[PDB]
Design an enzyme around this catalytic site. Structure first.
Site, PDB file in Angstrom:
ATOM      1  N   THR A   1       0.877  -1.204   0.000  1.00 16.93           N
ATOM      2  CA  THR A   1       0.000   0.000   0.000  1.00 16.93           C
ATOM      3  C   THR A   1       0.893   1.226   0.000  1.00 16.93           C
ATOM      4  O   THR A   1       1.834   1.315   0.792  1.00 16.93           O
ATOM      5  CB  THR A   1      -0.909   0.072   1.239  1.00 16.93           C
ATOM      6  OG1 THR A   1      -1.624  -1.157   1.386  1.00 16.93           O
ATOM      7  CG2 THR A   1      -1.927   1.224   1.085  1.00 16.93           C
ATOM      8  N   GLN A   2       0.610   2.175  -0.883  1.00 19.97           N
ATOM      9  CA  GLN A   2       1.359   3.421  -0.893  1.00 19.97           C
ATOM     10  C   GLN A   2       0.564   4.600  -0.353  1.00 19.97           C
ATOM     11  O   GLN A   2       1.173   5.572   0.104  1.00 19.97           O
ATOM     12  CB  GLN A   2       1.852   3.714  -2.316  1.00 19.97           C
ATOM     13  CG  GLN A   2       2.702   2.575  -2.886  1.00 19.97           C
ATOM     14  CD  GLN A   2       3.894   2.249  -1.996  1.00 19.97           C
ATOM     15  OE1 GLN A   2       4.413   3.120  -1.296  1.00 19.97           O
ATOM     16  NE2 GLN A   2       4.339   0.993  -2.029  1.00 19.97           N
TER      17      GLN A   2
END
Lengths: 231, 212, 230, 221, 208, 241, 207, 195, 222
Positions: C1-2
């Site tokens: 996840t960014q």
């Protein structure tokens, strides 16, 4: 017979000859005795020397302050199994800050040893181990065999002529498990038990090795001068 | 940083400062900028402390394997080539190195190999490395002679490092001197610039612009 | 996840003379859209542990699944697992911190901040914080998000140092926590009126008061304000 | 995704004859918020060594755990023998440089007694590069702390009166108690002028008699 | 017994002989097996020439790779060690024994070595490998002297040809000679040269 | 699969024996076409023999028939199609000629003859095909990967008798219909059981078949040259026979 | 890879002897050059593993040489990673973790040690040991002669006497070779001159 | 920056390369030889990035020597230049391109003709009578076009090279510290003391 | 694995398989190299059956004996290598170089699976020279030059004939010697003439017949 030479072959009677010969491998080794009370667990080992000019084999392997083990049979297999046990306990400590429970360690060694007895190319570990430790659930003692079987015990002896030691331990079971508040008498009972397995030889400051772990005792190995008080 | 090494009739003189800096903050003034590969081989670290220190310590282990296997010392050319190849294989990865591999071998004589981050490897008689290299050159090239006496060569190296320490902000500290002889290397001690400068000003009469 | 998409705002917790109290609102916000109001961000992991999680809600559900798997795998071949050799707060926190730091190192971080609160078998309160970067610390009071700024001073006014813990009773700590929820509701735009509160006590075990309301709001002074300037 | 942070801590190693001192504040920070008043960052490492991995807190924890694992494996292999300070320094150098291209952003210090019984302080950069030092500050307030320690412990820029700047003040040994006083005053100044220091001062003393821990209060504002 | 059978295979290869003088090392072979590995060093083999190709190519590649990794060329010791190491690694194994001879970089002492299917290698002043190696070695022991070594290239070539002619049928068509000299001055003796020396020794053999 | 002391490859001869145990298959080259024929056995009267075709298309210009183990033929055939597309047509934009595809199939079967852990294929193939350059072709490919072109040939349990009959009948001036007549007679003489359009099956590599192309409006594209003769087409010829 | 029903898994080389003492450890090897042409100096039956560890072997077969290289790499990497020379027992364990061998060396942990690998790979620390075909005769003499107060000077003559007793040819500085490890000098090999004067000392003892 | 020039003469190939080695603000050496002897009658000169030049030069030299050792004859200058081009072109699309320009001057003992090949860092081989790499060609090419002839002897070629080098000294801003000149001809490779 | 006494089983049995294969004959001239094969059936397609002599490059050809299936693998290996050499170097492979590569590929399968049951004669001319070349190879992976040599099932006989039968001068004598070796051992013969400048040609059945009838007239004369 034609079923002896491979680990993945059942005999017509369903026996795994290649594992029973691994058990014979322990039957070749020298005697090591283990016993426990509710608070302390003790290991006693009769070391061997290749020659009068040669030093004795160290038969007690310290894992850490709460656990350790002794050997009977092929020492290199003991090295491998002990370093795997070290890896497992270390992994548990790093990933959980959790002391690897002695039963968990016993079953991990069981699982690892079982693999060699089912897949081709692997050889059953020709060494049996006695494992002692103390954790949140008290003192423990385990018996490990090549077949993978792991057994929790009040006391036991593995190696040559260990049957006499086991008979003495069975006779005195109701006594040594009562030992409380002090390790001296437990070690004395252990050395008395191991003495049953001696022929043309006697316990001496160089033959004998003693180890203990318990509530007030981080895993310590007594040898040489330290063991003189028990011989 | 300032480091210099020049061949002369008596062997090699290796001189380095001691200051290490992180921005304006002077991290330390007692950094050992010579890695002692073996009793006849000498590394001179500049640029990035971590890279030079680690990789020349590893070069020491490679040298040790070399004597153990072949019963003869690694040549200066061979050690410098190993270091050059290694630094080259990490080109673009961020290594910061400037290294003079100074040594003495029976079949080579005194030899200096300059090695740096960008993979270069130069055999040469005089080298100055580090942020203060130009100031050291200004003195060496104006005073260097092949037939300098050992005392004069040591003083020349000391003075050349002193000039760069004076004029370069990142090159102060203390001057460490090594003399690579036919039979090994001799560590001629540590000289603090805060005293060497005044001693040299008094004895030479130079630095006439400096008040005092 | 960014990047976090759906997030739970804040969790606060403090330790009192006999245990730890921890609370969190039930709102998961999709940006400025208060989209999901039924989210549960307090994750009991036993009678001695509850885990509060903030940040990405999907990563929170992943972490909840990890905790369920921890509980499941602890019981394997563990005949004592229900009374001793059970999962302590310390083991849960250490596993979570290891996982979080490893994910950080692989540049695939769990965008969560996790407060593991509980009591060890010896009765000592456990209360530690861990975030996406693997940064961990302990304190008598812990908070996440806007709680670290708004709520945490209020809790520290009650227990400012380790010496104040035995002086703090259940009622005092619960009043402090509820007041912190009211303040965060006032001043945190991502917060909600509904919140869950869990109390772990060395004597009476885990109490889990769900869907509490923020009460005693003060708004009647708003009638006198007449806009900007005049 | 920025994988690094700065938790605002300061550590200080000082060595002399008979002892080595490693001191560091207990304050923990994130931006301008105080995470906790008491998070120890100087650790009694056993084997008569003290370690600290000040800097980015997560990397400090990771590196400390790795060093604990490495020293324990050293005990497993080399028959539970005492680890020396130089061996620990090399171990930590190899740990740090093992991640050359993704460094541990922590400024590590290990302090202890060397094989000759003399105090030793080793200090590392995030990549490695250990240098044995007589004293070495580190962390946020290193620049504030260190010049004063130079002046007092090493008497730099101090000359014997009446000699008109020709004779330096000799570098007589500081006793352990005097080093504690200097450390306390230096950390008081760092607390007073640096916003990231002032919660609590923890000091670990290393000597043949063993590691000894002392704790002192700071301003905490 | 696999390596034993490999050695039996060696026992059927053509014979090769090497002689070291003060300033020369000369290799001879029954009717070029002596092949150059680097400018200053050569390799000779006896046994399965099919299996010898892999060994030769690995040796050449290693010599060039060493010259590329270290500025210095390989020493004869290093090349002999590499040949032994490779020849072990295949233990079907290579059924070949080998000699390695030459000079070290900027050196003056000729080197000569022998290597065996066991991977054993040892330095020799003169050595033989192949089918009739025992007879040639016995002949050498009574004609070479450690305390009176050959002094010149002429002596070295004479001794090598004389040793080979002990069993060889007709030298001019049945032997070959290569002369290795310092600083890559390696040369191979031509037909007229070898015939000159062969006739010179023949004039004496007939007399006794 | 290793050499025996006599120099023969040991297990290949057993594959040849398996082929000899297979049902008869035929191939005949006319000047203007190629015929491949074979009888199809049935496991039971209930089995739908029309489900399985021993003759199969490899490329629109190439067809194959076999004698031996059927499953091996099936897997070898889809391997052959895969190689004919991926290895040749994917590159050159055209189907491989009979020689090239025969070579690739021979390579496929030879790999099993030169690799451990796998037995050789138990089928011999007759691969009929046509080329713009080589012209019409007929190849017999053995389990060993050895392939040789034939004017006319037969494989299977009737190999020798069929070969001796073809040697009599074949001539340099056969047209495709004469080849079909000769093939029908030869295969009828070899079938011990019932002989009709459903037990026999035929395929021809002849002139272009735009009726099978499936689309119109491209003058350049020609259409398959391989085509199977339907049960009714074969019955018509056996009735006219 | 298979146990027998008795629990076990399914000597002709040249002799090597070694003695350990409070002052040092001495090693000796039969050279037995097979021809006068063979370069006797090129028979390295004793090699250095580390500056304080040497290994005497019955024969430097390539299988032995690979083990030597592995042991050298282990010692060098131990120095690289720990900045300390490898302890003898640790080195023997590392090699075991990887031919008759006498691993011998010195360290400050256990002083002077000599190790011999039993056929099952288990190293035993020895006061004195011999290997090769000469071990059968040597062992009784070693049991007879060793005493706790044995000096290095006496140990050298002891090993030389064993070599003289078992070897097939009259001792000289070329056909037999000695080596010793000392705390101050480290591992070193006795040059031909020192071996020669020791042989003359042996002869004087005989005289 | 480097100067490397080549002129193919009726009998010989004349290669010239600058002696200076510059790194940043300082000249480190003033006697560097930017050439490697690929074979007894084949010579290569290289220019480009610091480490890449020497690393590629030694890699190519080792490979050419390995080929010559294996086949027991000297590779023709055409073959050597083709191998170098294939190595350069194969590198630009790899992770670590070689930023190296090379001039290969050789004497083909089988054709008995001198040969000069210009190969840029991209891998563009071209046989030329006179070649120059980088900015060195911007000054010399017009002069070479003016004065070059196919039938020159090596001495006229050296005079033309003097003209080119002094033109470079005059107009070009950098100080390349002179050139080192080597002749490749029937008798092998030699160096001119002062052309 | 080696046999006791130093033999190698599979290579010996591959040699047996070669010995039982059809023959391949070769003769090298002063100005050309001629290779000859006996074709050794009434329905086999003569028009398209491949000749045993195969091109490996524009200037070099290969002929084989023994297992036909393995010959294809060996030939494709040689062709691929010959083209790869021109990929790496401008100059085409020398004949020596090509025979060396085929020897290596044959050898590698003996130590690595079964050896190729093939032996070969290799002929050609160097890319810009003019000397004739002829070379031989066998399953063991060894090669040698020759003036005239043969392989296959008649080798034990025709080899002594060729020894009995100063190289021949001109292509007429070369083809005559080849065909006379084929005929003297007992017109169905392939003859391929290899000439510099890559002129590789196979003689037609009528050309073969002309030479054969001339030689039979000579044989009638005695």
């Amino acid at each position: 017979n034609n079923y002896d030479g491979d680990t993945v072959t059942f005999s017509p009677t369903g026996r795994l000859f290649q594992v029973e010969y691994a058990l014979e491998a322990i039957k070749q080794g020298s005697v090591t005795v283990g016993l426990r009370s509710n608070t302390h667990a003790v290991l006693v080992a009769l070391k061997r020397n290749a020659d009068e000019l040669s030093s004795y084999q160290k038969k007690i392997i310290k894992c850490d302050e709460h656990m350790g083990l002794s050997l009977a049979g092929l020492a290199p297999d003991a090295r491998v199994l002990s370093n795997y046990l070290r890896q497992q306990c270390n992994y548990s400590s790093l990933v959980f800050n959790r002391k690897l429970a002695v039963e968990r360690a016993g079953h991990l060694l069981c699982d690892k040893a079982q693999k060699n007895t089912q897949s081709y190319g692997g050889r059953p570990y020709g060494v049996g181990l006695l494992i002692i430790g103390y954790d949140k659930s008290g003192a423990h003692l385990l018996e490990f065999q090549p077949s993978g079987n792991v057994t929790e015990l009040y006391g036991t002896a593995i190696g040559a002529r260990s049957q006499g030691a086991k008979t003495y331990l069975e006779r005195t079971l109701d006594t040594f498990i009562k030992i409380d508040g002090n390790p001296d008498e437990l070690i004395k009972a252990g050395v008395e038990a191991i003495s049953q397995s001696l022929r043309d030889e006697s316990l001496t400051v160089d033959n004998l090795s003693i180890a203990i772990v318990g509530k007030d005792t981080p895993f310590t190995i007594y040898d040489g001068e330290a063991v003189a008080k028990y011989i | 940083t300032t480091t210099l090494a020049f061949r002369f009739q008596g062997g090699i003189i290796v001189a380095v400062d001691s200051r290490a800096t992180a921005g304006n903050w002077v991290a330390s003034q007692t950094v050992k900028k010579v890695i002692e590969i073996n009793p006849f081989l000498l590394g001179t670290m500049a640029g990035g402390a971590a890279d030079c220190q680690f990789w020349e310590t590893w070069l020491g282990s490679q040298c040790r394997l070399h004597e153990l296997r072949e019963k003869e010392r690694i040549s200066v050319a061979a050690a410098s080539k190993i270091l050059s190849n290694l630094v080259y294989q990490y080109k673009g990865a961020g290594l910061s190195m400037g290294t003079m591999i100074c040594g003495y071998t029976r079949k080579e004589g005194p030899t200096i190999y300059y090695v740096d981050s960008d993979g270069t490897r130069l055999k040469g008689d005089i080298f100055c490395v580090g942020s203060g290299q130009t100031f050291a050159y200004g003195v060496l090239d104006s005073n260097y002679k092949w037939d300098l006496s050992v005392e004069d060569a040591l003083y020349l190296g000391k003075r050349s490092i002193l000039a760069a320490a004076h004029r370069d902000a990142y090159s102060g500290g203390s001057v460490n001197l090594y003399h690579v002889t036919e039979d090994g290397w001799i560590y001629h001690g540590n000289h603090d610039v805060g005293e060497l400068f005044w001693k040299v000003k008094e004895e030479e009469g130079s630095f006439n612009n400096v008040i005092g | 996840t960014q990047q976090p998409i759906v997030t739970g705002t804040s969790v606060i917790s403090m330790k009192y003379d006999n245990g730890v109290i921890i609370a969190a609102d039930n709102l998961g916000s999709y940006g400025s859209l208060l989209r999901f109001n039924g989210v549960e961000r307090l994750i009991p992991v036993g009678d001695n542990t509850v885990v509060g999680i903030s940040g990405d809600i999907s990563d929170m559900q992943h972490i909840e699944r990890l905790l369920k798997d921890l509980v499941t795998e602890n019981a394997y071949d563990n005949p004592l697992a229900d009374a001793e050799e059970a999962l302590e707060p310390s083991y849960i926190f250490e596993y979570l911190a290891t996982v979080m730091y490893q994910r950080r190192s692989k540049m695939n971080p769990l965008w969560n901040a996790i407060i593991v609160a509980g009591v060890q078998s010896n009765g000592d309160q456990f209360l530690r914080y861990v975030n996406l970067l693997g940064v961990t610390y302990s304190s008598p009071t812990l908070a996440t998000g806007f709680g670290a700024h708004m709520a945490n001073p209020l809790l520290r006014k009650v227990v400012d140092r380790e010496s104040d813990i035995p002086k703090t009773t259940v009622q005092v700590a619960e009043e402090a926590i509820v007041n912190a929820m009211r303040v965060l509701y006032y001043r945190d735009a991502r917060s909600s009126r509904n919140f869950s509160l869990a109390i772990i006590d060395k004597n009476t075990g885990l109490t889990f008061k769900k869907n509490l309301q923020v009460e005693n709001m003060k708004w009647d002074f708003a009638k006198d304000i007449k806009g900007y300037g005049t | 995704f920025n994988p690094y942070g700065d938790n605002g801590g300061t550590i200080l190693g000082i060595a002399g004859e008979d002892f080595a001192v490693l001191a560091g504040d207990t304050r923990n920070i994130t931006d301008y918020s105080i995470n906790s008043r008491y998070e120890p960052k100087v650790f009694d490492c056993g084997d008569n060594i003290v370690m600290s991995a000040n800097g980015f807190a997560a990397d400090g924890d990771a590196l400390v755990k790795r060093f604990k694992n490495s020293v324990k494996w050293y005990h497993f292999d080399h028959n539970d023998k005492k680890l020396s300070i130089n061996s620990a320094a090399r171990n930590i150098q190899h740990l740090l440089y093992g991640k050359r291209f993704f460094p541990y952003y922590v400024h590590t210090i290990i302090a202890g007694l060397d094989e000759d019984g003399k105090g030793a302080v080793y200090s590392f950069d995030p990549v490695g590069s250990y240098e044995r030092e007589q004293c070495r500050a580190g962390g946020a307030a290193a620049s504030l702390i260190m010049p004063f320690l130079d002046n007092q412990v090493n008497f730099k820029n101090q000359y014997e009166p009446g000699t008109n700047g020709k004779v330096k003040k000799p570098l007589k040994y500081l006793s352990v108690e005097e080093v504690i006083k200097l450390v306390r005053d230096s950390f008081t100044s760092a607390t007073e002028r640096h916003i990231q220091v002032g919660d609590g001062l923890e000091i670990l003393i290393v000597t043949k008699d063993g590691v000894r821990k002392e704790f002192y209060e700071l301003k905490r504002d | 017994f696999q390596v034993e059978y490999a050695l039996e295979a060696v026992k059927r290869g053509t014979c090769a002989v090497g002689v070291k003088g003060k300033n020369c090392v000369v290799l001879g072979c029954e009717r070029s097996k002596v092949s150059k590995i680097d400018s200053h060093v050569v390799l000779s083999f006896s046994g399965l020439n099919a299996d010898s190709r892999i060994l030769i190519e690995k040796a050449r590649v290693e010599a060039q790779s060493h010259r590329l990794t270290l500025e210095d060329p390989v020493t004869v010791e290093y090349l002999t060690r590499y040949v032994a190491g490779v020849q072990q690694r295949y233990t079907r194994p290579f059924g070949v024994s080998t000699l390695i001879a030459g000079f070290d970089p900027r050196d003056d002492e000729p080197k000569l070595y022998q290597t065996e299917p066991s991977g054993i290698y040892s330095s020799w002043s003169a050595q033989t490998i192949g089918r009739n190696s025992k007879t040639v070695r016995e002949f050498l022991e009574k004609n070479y002297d450690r305390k009176e070594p050959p002094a010149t290239v002429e002596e070295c070539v004479k001794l090598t040809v004389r040793s080979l002619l002990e069993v060889v049928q007709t030298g001019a068509k049945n032997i070959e000679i290569t002369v290795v000299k310092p600083d890559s001055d390696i040369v191979a003796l031509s037909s007229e040269e070898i015939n000159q020396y062969v006739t010179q020794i023949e004039q004496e053999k007939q007399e006794q | 699969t290793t050499f025996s002391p006599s120099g023969k490859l040991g297990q290949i001869d057993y594959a040849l024996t398996a082929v000899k145990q297979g049902v008869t298959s035929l191939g005949i080259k006319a000047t203007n076409g190629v015929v491949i024929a074979t009888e199809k056995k049935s496991s039971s009267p209930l089995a739908m023999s029309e489900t399985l075709s021993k003759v199969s298309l490899l490329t629109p210009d190439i067809g194959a028939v076999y004698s031996g183990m059927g499953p091996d033929y099936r897997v070898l055939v889809d391997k052959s199609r895969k190689v004919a597309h991926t290895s040749y047509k994917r590159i050159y934009g055209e189907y491989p000629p009979t020689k090239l595809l025969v070579s690739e199939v021979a390579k496929i079967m030879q790999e099993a003859t030169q690799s451990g852990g796998v037995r050789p294929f138990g089928v011999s193939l007759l691969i009929a095909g046509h080329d713009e350059f080589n012209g019409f072709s007929l190849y017999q490919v053995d389990p060993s990967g050895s392939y040789f072109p034939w004017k006319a040939t037969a494989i299977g349990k009737g190999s020798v008798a069929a070969k001796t009959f073809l040697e009599k009948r074949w001539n340099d001036e056969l047209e495709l219909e004469d080849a079909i007549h000769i093939a029908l007679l030869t295969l009828k003489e070899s079938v011990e059981g019932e002989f009709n359009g459903d037990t026999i099956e035929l395929a021809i590599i002849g002139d272009e078949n735009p009726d099978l192309l499936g689309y119109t409006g491209i003058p350049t594209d020609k259409g398959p040259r391989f085509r199977k003769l339907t049960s009714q087409e074969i019955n018509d010829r056996l009735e006219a026979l | 890879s298979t146990f027998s029903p008795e629990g076990r898994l399914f000597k002709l080389g040249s002799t090597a002897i070694g003695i350990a003492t409070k002052e040092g450890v001495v090693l000796g090897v039969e050279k037995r050059a097979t021809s006068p042409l063979l370069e006797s100096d090129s028979i390295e039956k004793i090699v250095e593993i580390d500056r304080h560890i040497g290994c005497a072997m019955s024969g430097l077969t390539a299988d032995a040489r690979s083990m030597i290289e592995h042991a050298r790499t282990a010692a060098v990497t131990h120095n690289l990673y720990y900045d300390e020379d490898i302890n003898v027992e640790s080195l023997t364990q590392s090699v075991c973790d990887l031919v008759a061998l006498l691993i011998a060396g010195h360290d400050a942990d256990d002083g002077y040690q000599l190790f011999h690998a039993e056929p099952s790979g288990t190293f035993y620390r020895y006061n004195a040991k011999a290997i090769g075909s000469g071990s059968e005769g040597a062992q009784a003499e070693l049991l007879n002669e060793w005493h706790s107060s044995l000096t290095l000077k006496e140990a050298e003559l002891l090993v030389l006497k064993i070599l003289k007793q078992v070897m097939e040819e009259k001792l000289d500085e070329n056909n037999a070779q000695l080596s010793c490890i000392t705390k101050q000098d480290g591992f070193k090999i006795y040059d031909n001159e020192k071996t020669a004067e020791l042989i003359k000392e042996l002869k004087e003892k005989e005289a | 920056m480097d100067i490397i020039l080549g002129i193919r003469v009726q009998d010989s190939v004349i290669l010239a390369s600058s002696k200076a080695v510059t790194r940043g603000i300082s000249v480190l050496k003033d006697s560097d030889d930017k050439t490697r002897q690929l074979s007894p009658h084949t010579l290569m000169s290289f220019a480009g990035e610091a480490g890449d030049t020497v690393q590629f030069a030694e890699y190519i030299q080792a490979n050419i020597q390995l080929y010559s050792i294996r086949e027991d004859y000297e590779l023709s200058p055409q073959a050597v230049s083709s191998f170098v081009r294939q190595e350069l072109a194969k590198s630009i699309r790899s992770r670590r391109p070689y930023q190296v320009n090379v001039l290969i001057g050789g004497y083909d003992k089988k054709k008995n003709k001198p040969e000069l090949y210009q190969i840029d860092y991209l891998g563009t081989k071209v046989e030329l009578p006179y070649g120059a790499h980088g900015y060195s060609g911007f000054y010399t090419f017009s002069l070479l076009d003016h004065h070059y002839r196919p039938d020159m002897t090596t001495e006229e070629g050296l005079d033309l090279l003097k003209l080119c080098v002094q033109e470079l000294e005059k107009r070009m801003p950098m100080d390349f510290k002179g050139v080192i000149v080597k002749i490749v001809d029937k008798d092998g490779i030699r160096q001119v003391d002062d052309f």
